Amino acid sequence: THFSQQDNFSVAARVLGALFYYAPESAEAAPLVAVLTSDGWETQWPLPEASLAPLVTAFQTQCEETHAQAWQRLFVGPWALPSPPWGSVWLDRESVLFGDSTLALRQWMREKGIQFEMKQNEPEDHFGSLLLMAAWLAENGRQTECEELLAWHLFPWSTRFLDVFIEKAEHPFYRALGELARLTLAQWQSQLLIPVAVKPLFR
């Protein structure tokens, strides 16, 4: 019955999350770059074809800039990232990392006995970390928590983050990845029984 337990929710969340968290040449993400750059993946993605046809091609579009170089520029640095993948940049009035929305997520994790750990020195509210934790909760049959994560701790900023990211990606693969993410999270959003939390955006 619950939308986290069907339509490839966990599988799709893990794919989107890893491609946003790990480098395209990494052991974690290279196989995923390879699935999205081959025909066939669209058959298993939980969205309709009229919207996937264009992304199939777009994911395969060659480009002088390397996946590795695009990711570096979009997610690592050294310079300012065009769309910072951490919730508190979007939700905290001050746009700092480890901000108030980050604290809210951490407190919620601790109340619900959620033991999922992020890597060291890293804030909990990274877009991909959130998608991997949602996947992980789904797999564990923790549907209520999964829905709360999305409603309360991801969807309030994820659309804004994706909007700016899709507009500034400037690389066919990552722009396609962004659009895929937006279409998919939107679809999930429409399946929630619970309202998305109403929060101002500060970037």
Tab-separated table of C-alpha atoms in Angstrom:
chain	number	residue	atom	x	y	z
A	1	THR	CA	0.000	0.000	0.000
A	2	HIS	CA	2.464	2.838	1.072
A	3	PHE	CA	4.205	4.583	-1.860
A	4	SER	CA	7.667	4.043	-0.303
A	5	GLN	CA	7.046	0.275	-0.615
A	6	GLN	CA	6.347	0.111	-4.374
A	7	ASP	CA	7.013	1.558	-7.839
A	8	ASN	CA	10.743	1.226	-7.323
A	9	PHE	CA	10.793	4.023	-4.733
A	10	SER	CA	13.871	2.832	-2.842
A	11	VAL	CA	15.704	1.879	-6.037
A	12	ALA	CA	15.030	5.305	-7.618
A	13	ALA	CA	15.918	7.175	-4.412
A	14	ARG	CA	19.278	5.336	-4.169
A	15	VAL	CA	20.110	6.124	-7.799
A	16	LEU	CA	19.325	9.835	-7.493
A	17	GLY	CA	20.997	10.130	-4.099
A	18	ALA	CA	24.269	8.426	-5.070
A	19	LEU	CA	24.612	10.355	-8.325
A	20	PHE	CA	24.296	13.596	-6.260
A	21	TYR	CA	26.578	12.405	-3.403
A	22	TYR	CA	29.370	10.499	-5.116
A	23	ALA	CA	31.684	11.308	-7.944
A	24	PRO	CA	30.758	9.884	-11.386
A	25	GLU	CA	34.102	7.981	-11.498
A	26	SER	CA	33.602	6.563	-7.988
A	27	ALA	CA	32.951	2.872	-7.301
A	28	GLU	CA	29.537	3.993	-5.953
A	29	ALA	CA	28.421	6.161	-8.907
A	30	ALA	CA	30.210	4.930	-12.099
A	31	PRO	CA	27.855	2.017	-12.528
A	32	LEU	CA	24.984	4.443	-12.234
A	33	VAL	CA	26.387	6.861	-14.826
A	34	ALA	CA	26.644	3.773	-17.037
A	35	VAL	CA	22.999	2.683	-16.501
A	36	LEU	CA	21.679	6.222	-17.272
A	37	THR	CA	23.865	6.483	-20.389
A	38	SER	CA	22.565	3.174	-21.799
A	39	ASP	CA	19.145	2.416	-23.250
A	40	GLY	CA	16.874	0.357	-20.969
A	41	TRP	CA	16.919	2.331	-17.693
A	42	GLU	CA	13.709	4.244	-18.659
A	43	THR	CA	11.825	0.925	-18.701
A	44	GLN	CA	12.392	0.616	-14.981
A	45	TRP	CA	12.184	4.244	-13.866
A	46	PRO	CA	8.782	5.000	-12.226
A	47	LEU	CA	7.732	7.849	-14.558
A	48	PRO	CA	5.962	8.048	-17.924
A	49	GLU	CA	7.785	7.869	-21.354
A	50	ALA	CA	6.512	11.198	-22.783
A	51	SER	CA	8.803	12.737	-20.179
A	52	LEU	CA	11.632	10.122	-20.303
A	53	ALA	CA	12.211	10.012	-24.068
A	54	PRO	CA	13.976	13.401	-24.013
A	55	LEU	CA	16.118	12.540	-20.988
A	56	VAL	CA	17.334	9.278	-22.548
A	57	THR	CA	18.969	11.257	-25.344
A	58	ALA	CA	20.115	14.022	-23.018
A	59	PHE	CA	21.874	11.609	-20.669
A	60	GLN	CA	23.779	10.311	-23.752
A	61	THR	CA	24.733	13.692	-25.226
A	62	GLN	CA	28.525	13.978	-25.632
A	63	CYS	CA	30.233	17.030	-24.268
A	64	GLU	CA	33.770	18.462	-24.033
A	65	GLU	CA	33.445	18.847	-20.294
A	66	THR	CA	33.827	15.555	-18.483
A	67	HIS	CA	31.303	14.120	-15.983
A	68	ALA	CA	34.170	14.222	-13.417
A	69	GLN	CA	34.873	17.898	-14.197
A	70	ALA	CA	31.139	18.843	-14.106
A	71	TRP	CA	30.642	17.154	-10.754
A	72	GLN	CA	33.755	18.698	-9.297
A	73	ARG	CA	32.461	22.163	-10.338
A	74	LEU	CA	28.868	21.544	-9.182
A	75	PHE	CA	29.419	19.658	-5.961
A	76	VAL	CA	33.000	20.073	-4.667
A	77	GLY	CA	34.756	23.185	-5.787
A	78	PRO	CA	37.051	24.844	-5.092
A	79	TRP	CA	34.880	27.843	-5.905
A	80	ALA	CA	31.292	28.599	-4.757
A	81	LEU	CA	28.770	26.005	-5.859
A	82	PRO	CA	26.000	27.325	-8.117
A	83	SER	CA	23.298	25.389	-6.179
A	84	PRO	CA	24.542	24.222	-2.717
A	85	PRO	CA	23.091	20.732	-2.006
A	86	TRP	CA	22.452	21.324	1.746
A	87	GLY	CA	19.011	22.208	3.135
A	88	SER	CA	20.099	24.896	5.585
A	89	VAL	CA	21.469	27.075	2.770
A	90	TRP	CA	17.836	27.201	1.576
A	91	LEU	CA	15.922	27.084	4.894
A	92	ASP	CA	18.112	28.960	7.425
A	93	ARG	CA	17.671	32.729	7.314
A	94	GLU	CA	21.458	33.000	7.375
A	95	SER	CA	22.153	30.255	4.848
A	96	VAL	CA	24.886	28.674	6.985
A	97	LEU	CA	25.731	24.964	6.965
A	98	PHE	CA	24.781	22.952	10.086
A	99	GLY	CA	21.914	25.414	10.446
A	100	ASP	CA	18.569	25.432	12.193
A	101	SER	CA	16.803	23.199	9.674
A	102	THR	CA	19.797	20.843	9.973
A	103	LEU	CA	19.296	20.784	13.734
A	104	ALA	CA	15.542	20.024	13.228
A	105	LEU	CA	16.382	17.004	11.028
A	106	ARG	CA	18.990	15.750	13.521
A	107	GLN	CA	16.477	16.087	16.416
A	108	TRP	CA	13.825	14.234	14.396
A	109	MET	CA	16.356	11.523	13.567
A	110	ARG	CA	17.163	11.132	17.262
A	111	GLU	CA	13.456	11.101	18.365
A	112	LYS	CA	12.601	8.390	15.804
A	113	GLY	CA	15.647	6.299	16.692
A	114	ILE	CA	17.087	6.695	13.220
A	115	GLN	CA	20.682	5.478	13.338
A	116	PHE	CA	21.613	6.287	9.745
A	117	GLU	CA	24.957	8.078	9.913
A	118	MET	CA	26.468	10.563	7.529
A	119	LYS	CA	30.189	10.671	6.779
A	120	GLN	CA	32.466	12.577	9.193
A	121	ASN	CA	32.274	16.312	9.555
A	122	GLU	CA	29.300	16.248	7.120
A	123	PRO	CA	25.871	17.746	7.830
A	124	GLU	CA	22.847	15.518	7.694
A	125	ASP	CA	20.887	17.675	5.251
A	126	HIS	CA	22.682	16.926	1.975
A	127	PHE	CA	20.203	16.259	-0.833
A	128	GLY	CA	21.715	12.832	-1.619
A	129	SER	CA	22.217	11.779	2.005
A	130	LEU	CA	18.497	12.542	2.486
A	131	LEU	CA	17.527	10.478	-0.571
A	132	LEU	CA	19.766	7.536	0.488
A	133	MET	CA	18.364	7.710	4.062
A	134	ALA	CA	14.789	7.729	2.658
A	135	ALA	CA	15.681	4.687	0.568
A	136	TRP	CA	17.235	3.057	3.566
A	137	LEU	CA	14.128	3.707	5.704
A	138	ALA	CA	11.860	2.366	2.928
A	139	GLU	CA	13.943	-0.840	2.763
A	140	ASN	CA	13.586	-1.210	6.518
A	141	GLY	CA	9.781	-0.976	6.301
A	142	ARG	CA	9.753	2.353	8.141
A	143	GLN	CA	7.146	3.992	5.961
A	144	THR	CA	5.881	6.678	8.381
A	145	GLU	CA	9.446	7.961	8.971
A	146	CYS	CA	10.177	7.786	5.269
A	147	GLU	CA	7.176	10.008	4.556
A	148	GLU	CA	8.104	12.409	7.364
A	149	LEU	CA	11.663	12.777	6.038
A	150	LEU	CA	10.320	13.729	2.629
A	151	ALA	CA	7.490	15.996	3.829
A	152	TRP	CA	9.363	17.717	6.587
A	153	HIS	CA	13.062	17.611	5.811
A	154	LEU	CA	13.536	17.385	2.006
A	155	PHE	CA	10.565	18.644	0.007
A	156	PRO	CA	10.488	21.981	1.681
A	157	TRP	CA	13.783	22.925	0.000
A	158	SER	CA	14.392	20.320	-2.671
A	159	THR	CA	12.316	22.010	-5.369
A	160	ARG	CA	14.108	25.346	-4.951
A	161	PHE	CA	17.465	23.556	-4.878
A	162	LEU	CA	16.661	21.576	-8.038
A	163	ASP	CA	15.220	24.655	-9.794
A	164	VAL	CA	18.480	26.534	-9.382
A	165	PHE	CA	20.600	23.440	-10.052
A	166	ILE	CA	18.870	22.533	-13.337
A	167	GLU	CA	19.278	26.152	-14.502
A	168	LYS	CA	23.023	26.279	-13.642
A	169	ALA	CA	24.183	22.693	-14.233
A	170	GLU	CA	25.492	23.548	-17.712
A	171	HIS	CA	26.289	19.942	-18.493
A	172	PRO	CA	23.954	17.628	-20.384
A	173	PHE	CA	24.322	14.729	-18.021
A	174	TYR	CA	23.791	16.656	-14.767
A	175	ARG	CA	21.103	18.831	-16.163
A	176	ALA	CA	19.322	15.652	-17.246
A	177	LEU	CA	19.980	14.224	-13.775
A	178	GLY	CA	18.444	17.307	-12.173
A	179	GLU	CA	15.338	17.190	-14.351
A	180	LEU	CA	14.923	13.472	-13.652
A	181	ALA	CA	15.162	14.267	-9.910
A	182	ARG	CA	12.616	17.033	-10.083
A	183	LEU	CA	10.059	14.960	-12.035
A	184	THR	CA	10.498	12.038	-9.631
A	185	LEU	CA	10.374	13.900	-6.323
A	186	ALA	CA	7.337	15.863	-7.675
A	187	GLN	CA	5.579	12.560	-8.367
A	188	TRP	CA	6.437	11.350	-4.843
A	189	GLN	CA	5.270	14.652	-3.401
A	190	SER	CA	1.831	14.069	-4.977
A	191	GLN	CA	1.607	10.739	-3.174
A	192	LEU	CA	2.116	12.035	0.382
A	193	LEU	CA	-0.881	11.723	2.760
A	194	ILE	CA	0.737	14.454	4.891
A	195	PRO	CA	1.313	18.127	3.972
A	196	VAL	CA	4.795	19.311	2.984
A	197	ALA	CA	6.085	21.624	5.714
A	198	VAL	CA	5.607	25.289	4.890
A	199	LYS	CA	8.999	27.019	5.166
A	200	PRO	CA	10.385	30.232	3.766
A	201	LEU	CA	13.267	30.059	1.303
A	202	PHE	CA	16.279	32.307	1.800
A	203	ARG	CA	18.166	31.586	-1.359
